[PDB]
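Cross-posted from the bioinformatics board.
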Amino acid sequence: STADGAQNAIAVVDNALAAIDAQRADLAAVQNRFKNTIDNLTNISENA
Amino acid sequence: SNAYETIDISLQNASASAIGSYQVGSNGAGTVASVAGTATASGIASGT
């Protein structure tokens, strides 16, 4: 409403989006690891 | 785009019959003066 909000909400959402996008980057690393792993596993399976 | 980054304004409190000359000027607040608007023997004295 009056004094707190206009600035406190930004103070929240800054680190909020920071942590959310950090989790997104963690998931991105996980899935890049997964894609490299599935390529490696397919190659090893074909050689086997 | 940052918190508490604002621009202030000093708009007048009121343009009603309360604005005017914020001024007594002489000899009219509380008690009259001793030399100003008064016959004296020595006159205006030194000081600041």
